[PDB]
């Protein structure tokens, strides 16, 4: 069911526009650098259109990765 836990509840509050909040914005990527599908995140219609141009910001400034490779795990 993909019914693990969306990342909206696994945190206190925060701002979606503070690019270098990388503790949080690591849990909005995958085991690739891919911005988590809206179903995983559980973000609003506004919210993940914001968190979109955020991790596109906090990428150019190196902080958050463009892609990874893969752990067979």
């Amino acid at each position: 069911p993909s019914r693990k836990a969306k990342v909206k509840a696994t945190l206190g509050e925060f701002d979606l526009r503070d690019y270098r909040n990388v503790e949080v914005l690591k849990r909005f990527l995958s085991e690739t650098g891919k911005i988590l599908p809206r179903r995983r995140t559980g973000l609003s219609a506004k919210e993940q259109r914001i968190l979109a141009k955020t991790i596109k910001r906090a990428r150019i400034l190196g902080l958050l990765p463009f892609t990874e490779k893969l752990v067979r795990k």
Binding site: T67, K69, L70, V71, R72
Partner: protein, 115 residues
């Protein structure tokens, strides 16, 4: 020639072939092999039993240089992709970590007609 403890396994699985070049912690070609070197001539080469075979004859040239440990890397989705991966755990070689890193554009080149 020389001796090497830890070395890393590169696997390139196409459709018309599957290729294993094994190296050292830098990425330097110790021994390499694909199905077409095993004896396979045409469409023969892509079979999952060819991938099992390259990841033998390549991992055999590599114990010839005394190979102990391997980490694996794989490039593609192809016939018997993981059949070689297994063909290495089954050759007598510690499989460290196993990684996939497929060439993935972010949309640059228009592919050929045949998409």
């Amino acid at each position: 020639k020389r001796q090497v403890a830890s070395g890393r396994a590169y696997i390139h699985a196409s459709y018309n072939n599957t290729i294993v070049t094994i190296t050292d912690p830098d990425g330097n070609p110790i021994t390499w092999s694909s199905g077409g070197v095993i004896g396979y001539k045409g469409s023969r080469k892509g079979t999952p039993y060819a991938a099992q075979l390259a990841a033998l004859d390549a991992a055999k040239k590599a114990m010839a240089y005394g190979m102990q440990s391997v980490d694996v890397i794989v490039r593609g989705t192809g016939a018997g992709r993981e059949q070689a991966i297994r063909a290495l755990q089954a050759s007598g070689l510690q499989v460290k970590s196993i990684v996939d890193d497929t060439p993935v554009p972010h949309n640059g080149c228009r592919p050929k007609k045949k998409f």
